[PDB]
Amino acid sequence: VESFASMLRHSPLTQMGPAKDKLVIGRIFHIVENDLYIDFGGKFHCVCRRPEVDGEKYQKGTRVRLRLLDLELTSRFLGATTDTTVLEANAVLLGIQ
Amino acid sequence: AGSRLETVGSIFSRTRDLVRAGVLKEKPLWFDVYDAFPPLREPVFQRPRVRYGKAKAPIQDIWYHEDRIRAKFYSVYGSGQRAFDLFNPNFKSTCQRFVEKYTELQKLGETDEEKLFVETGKALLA
Amino acid sequence: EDFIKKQIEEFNIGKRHLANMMGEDPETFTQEDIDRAIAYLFPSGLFEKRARPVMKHPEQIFPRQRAIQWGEDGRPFHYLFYTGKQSYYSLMHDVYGMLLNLEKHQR
Amino acid sequence: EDFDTRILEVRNVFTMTAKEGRKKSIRVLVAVGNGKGAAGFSIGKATDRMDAFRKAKNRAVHHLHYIERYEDHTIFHDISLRFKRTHIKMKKQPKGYGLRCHRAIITICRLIGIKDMYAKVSGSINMLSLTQGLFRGLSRQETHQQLADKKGLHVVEIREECGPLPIVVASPRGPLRKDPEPEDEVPDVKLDWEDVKTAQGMKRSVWSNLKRAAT
Amino acid sequence: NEDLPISMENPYKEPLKKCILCGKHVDYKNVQLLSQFVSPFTGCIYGRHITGLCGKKQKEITKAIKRAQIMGFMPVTYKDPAYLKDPKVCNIRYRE
Amino acid sequence: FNDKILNEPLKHSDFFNVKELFSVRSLFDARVHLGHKAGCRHRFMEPYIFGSRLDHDIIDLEQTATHLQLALNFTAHMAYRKGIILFISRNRQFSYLIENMARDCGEYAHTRYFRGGMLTNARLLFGPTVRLPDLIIFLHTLNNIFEPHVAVRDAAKMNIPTVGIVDTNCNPCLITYPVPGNDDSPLAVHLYCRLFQTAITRAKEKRQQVEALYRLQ
Ligand SMILES: [Zn+2]
Ligand SMILES: [Zn+2]
Numbered sequence A: 001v002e003s004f005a006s007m008l009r010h011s012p013l014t015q016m017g018p019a020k021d022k023l024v025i026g027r028i029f030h031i032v033e034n035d036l037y038i039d040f041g042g043k044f045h046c047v048c049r050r051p052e053v054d055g056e057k058y059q060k061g062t063r064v065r066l067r068l069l070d071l072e073l074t075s076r077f078l079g080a081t082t083d084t085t086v087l088e089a090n091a092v093l094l095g096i097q
Numbered sequence B: 001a002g003s004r005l006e007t008v009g010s011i012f013s014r015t016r017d018l019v020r021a022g023v024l025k026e027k028p029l030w031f032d033v034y035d036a037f038p039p040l041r042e043p044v045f046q047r048p049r050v051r052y053g054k055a056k057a058p059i060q061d062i063w064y065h066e067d068r069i070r071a072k073f074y075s076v077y078g079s080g081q082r083a084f085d086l087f088n089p090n091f092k093s094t095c096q097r098f099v100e101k102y103t104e105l106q107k108l109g110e111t112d113e114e115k116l117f118v119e120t121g122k123a124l125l126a
Numbered sequence C: 001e002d003f004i005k006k007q008i009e010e011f012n013i014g015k016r017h018l019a020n021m022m023g024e025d026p027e028t029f030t031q032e033d034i035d036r037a038i039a040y041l042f043p044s045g046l047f048e049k050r051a052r053p054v055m056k057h058p059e060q061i062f063p064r065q066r067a068i069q070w071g072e073d074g075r076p077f078h079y080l081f082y083t084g085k086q087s088y089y090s091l092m093h094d095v096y097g098m099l100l101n102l103e104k105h106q107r
Numbered sequence D: 001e002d003f004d005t006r007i008l009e010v011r012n013v014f015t016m017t018a019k020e021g022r023k024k025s026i027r028v029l030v031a032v033g034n035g036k037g038a039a040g041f042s043i044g045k046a047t048d049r050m051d052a053f054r055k056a057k058n059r060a061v062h063h064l065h066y067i068e069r070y071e072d073h074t075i076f077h078d079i080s081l082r083f084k085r086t087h088i089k090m091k092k093q094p095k096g097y098g099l100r101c102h103r104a105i106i107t108i109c110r111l112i113g114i115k116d117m118y119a120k121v122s123g124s125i126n127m128l129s130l131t132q133g134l135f136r137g138l139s140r141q142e143t144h145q146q147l148a149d150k151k152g153l154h155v156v157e158i159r160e161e162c163g164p165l166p167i168v169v170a171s172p173r174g175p176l177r178k179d180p181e182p183e184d185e186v187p188d189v190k191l192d193w194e195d196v197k198t199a200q201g202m203k204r205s206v207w208s209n210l211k212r213a214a215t
Numbered sequence E: 001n002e003d004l005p006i007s008m009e010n011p012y013k014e015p016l017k018k019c020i021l022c023g024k025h026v027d028y029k030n031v032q033l034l035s036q037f038v039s040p041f042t043g044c045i046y047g048r049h050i051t052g053l054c055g056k057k058q059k060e061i062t063k064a065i066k067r068a069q070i071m072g073f074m075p076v077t078y079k080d081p082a083y084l085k086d087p088k089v090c091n092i093r094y095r096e
Numbered sequence F: 001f002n003d004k005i006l007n008e009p010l011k012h013s014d015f016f017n018v019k020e021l022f023s024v025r026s027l028f029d030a031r032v033h034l035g036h037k038a039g040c041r042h043r044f045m046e047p048y049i050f051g052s053r054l055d056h057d058i059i060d061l062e063q064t065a066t067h068l069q070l071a072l073n074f075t076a077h078m079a080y081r082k083g084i085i086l087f088i089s090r091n092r093q094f095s096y097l098i099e100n101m102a103r104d105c106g107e108y109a110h111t112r113y114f115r116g117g118m119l120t121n122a123r124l125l126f127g128p129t130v131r132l133p134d135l136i137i138f139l140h141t142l143n144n145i146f147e148p149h150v151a152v153r154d155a156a157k158m159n160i161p162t163v164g165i166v167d168t169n170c171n172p173c174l175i176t177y178p179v180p181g182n183d184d185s186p187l188a189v190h191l192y193c194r195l196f197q198t199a200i201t202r203a204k205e206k207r208q209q210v211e212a213l214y215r216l217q
Helices: A004-009 B011-021 B031-036 B065-076 B094-108 B113-125 C002-022 C031-041 C086-105 D049-062 D103-112 D127-139 D144-151 D193-200 E033-037 E055-071 F024-029 F061-080 F095-104 F150-158 F186-216
Strands: A024-032 A035-039 A045-049 A063-066 A093-096 C074-076 D004-017 D021-033 D039-046 D078-083 D086-092 D117-123 D155-157 D167-170 F034-037 F049-053 F056-059 F085-088 F108-110 F135-138 F162-166 F177-180
Touching: A004 F024, A004 F049, A004 F061, A035 A063, A045 A063, B011 B031, B031 F061, B065 B094, B094 B113, C002 C031, C086 F095, D004 D049, D004 D103, D004 D127, D021 D049, D021 D103, D021 D127, D039 D049, D039 D103, D039 D127, D078 D127, D086 D127, D103 D117, D103 D127, D144 D155, D144 D167, E033 E055, F024 F061, F024 F186, F056 F061, F061 F085, F061 F135, F061 F162, F061 F177, F061 F186, F085 F095, F095 F108, F095 F186, F135 F150, F150 F162
Parallel strands: F085 F108, F085 F135, F135 F162, F162 F177
Antiparallel strands: A024 A035, A024 A063, A035 A045, A063 A093, D004 D021, D021 D039, D078 D086, D086 D117, D155 D167, F034 F056, F049 F056
16 A cells, blocks of 8 residues: 555655746636636636637636646735635636647 | 533533433434444534744644755756646656656765766756 | 315305305306405495405415425425525526536526 | 522613613523532523523523532532632532532532532622533533543542541543552642631631531 | 655745845945935935835945935935936836 | 344444545545645644645645544444434535535535524424434535634534534534545545445445345344
8 A cells, every 4th residue: 555645745746846937737617707717736726817819719628728826825914813815826827738 | 401512521421411410311313323433532612722932833844855856956947848737646747757867866876966966967868 | 284175165165155145056156256246245345455355265365384394204305404495595506507507518 | 390490690780772761671590400410500681580580591401511429419529710700619528518608509509419518709709600610610520530541540539437448439441550650749739828727727717617507 | 654754944945035235335435326226306215115125235325325415425405417327226116 | 123223333343334435545636635825724623734735734644534434434324324414515616516415315405604593593493393403514614704614513502413524724623523634626525525425325225225124024
């Protein structure tokens, strides 16, 4: 059997390093008007505006490429004891495939 | 009857104590199942508190020798155009090729870091 | 309810009497004739039409009593019982599902 | 049907309203218990005293506790507990001592089943804090079996009435711990000056050991 | 056990940010640099939020500016028009 | 003599063999091990966290597997003994999935706004002789303002056992069976729904088989 520490080591989410400026492919799984909801793996999904150039091959199931500025997007504010999460990661949609 | 005091103890403790007293005449459906297979921690209410002085979280941080040489790799040679997939298991990145072949150089046996980096760099170029 | 059942029986027997009362021993005595007959029998003179006399069937007279949502074992019938608004939430669920499968297909 | 309800405090409580003025609302506090350990207190607030009584006793039977008793006559140890600003110091007492406690504590412990306890309350004698702190301590008792299981050792009793005979009261239900209990010479415990004053006999009071009625 | 994580100092650690003058020598006679950190119209010394300087460098810039202005190297009320062409570094946008 | 059909699974450890239903590989590929950032941590979920990976928490999948085994065995025994299992969450993303899972099985779901007093003022709210659920599964403990749930507190008040998926920002304090795992990702939520549905289904056909056997003998 393979231990969870070995699993975590030979997991791609750990071999990625920090999410910043890492090119990751993902799928579109939900659309609202022009707000594409893309998964890139990991815990959360990202939301990206539909690019107006070539804006019709961005449908449910499309493979896109993402830059992944952030992985969870949390921040603590002035009076808070825990931080305010938005349950969503940050990424920039660069194209298809 | 029952006791709606969620904070004094657990539901198991309150129910066992009431049926021992003789107030809750019929045992609830969950009592014998709990008595057969209790969880690892008794669900007793606890007030969360702030750590104030010299108290730190015992949660450690995850790091590796592979993470060191990944640091050096992403330092000198940027994240390549070969994008990460991150969905399929056993996905091996270009940096993953770098670390595994750095590792085979390490175990074949040698001394110095800069020269490690150079023969693995020419080996990637090959 | 047994109240509704014996009230329906009483209404049937009463409208039979009432048609025989006025002129209408034939079985077909319609509701507007019932209203006309009771209007003649008891001359209303009350400004409120709900304060006027009425002869309707107990379905229209009595309000809609909702059926028992659970049997003789607990175990309520609808899966959305514990919301307390089972019909509205089931409707919301059904419309949302119809939107979902429509999207995956495409007064 | 085996549950007895006793009122403890009835207060005439006013609030101010825009039109009427002073609005009298009766707030009552009751304790409900059967003489087997189960007891609970509650507050009932209404405009009528009978409505307040009914609300209070029904909410208490929905908010019951359970109180462990040593031999169904007294508590397991001495309990020192401060609830907000009410310090209650209670001591287990042997049989026949009677309920030498505050009158509210006497009623509550008669509803519980306790018979032989000493109890001195100090700070603010507030009725609603008294009952709540008493129930906190009596529900946070530690019993002999729990002590034996926690320490892994035998729990024994040595009475002056019987003599040097050791009476095992609680044994561990699992393994027996073999290294003995560390004899800490000159133990670091927080004593009470009233207890030390009474033990040494400089507690000169004309009120302490007065001849009162039963319990 | 060979795959359990181990304790080290944080890799992927970016080096700490350095101010533009960090490691540089600020002198009161360097009225081109001091003029850079002085406002063009009213001669006001800028703050940390405008200059982007660390605390020590902001203190040296302030002291050198006041010293040069009282010793007769810098105008007080305005920036030198001869030095109103230097590389702008201060994050201030007056025009629109 | 029905205490055999109400007592033999109580002495058979894992009477429903639910340990075959999940593995650490399966939980990991469902991304159960992921958690929130270190500032979203809870003092009481601290013992369940394996570590922090780049300020993102990782949940111990061994503890997850043990707690999941215990919770699955408990809900299987309750569904065998014909309790009422109420599924509660406030995602608005997996609400449809949870209600559809309940309807695929035969248990109940509350995925909408929990109005004041469902479980507590239940007799005046529903009817004088309603049976409250004998088990509640919270798939997501937090409500939509990230606070622990009113039905968690109220099930503790009403002495109803609670099986709950706890994330790193959750309070596992008043949940009888906490399963430390990720509940923010579709794969993890799908695996939780699948496991609980299969366990409840498998408990109910085992119950009908056992009562059929007792009726034949
Ligand atoms: Zn500097
Ligand atoms: Zn979460």
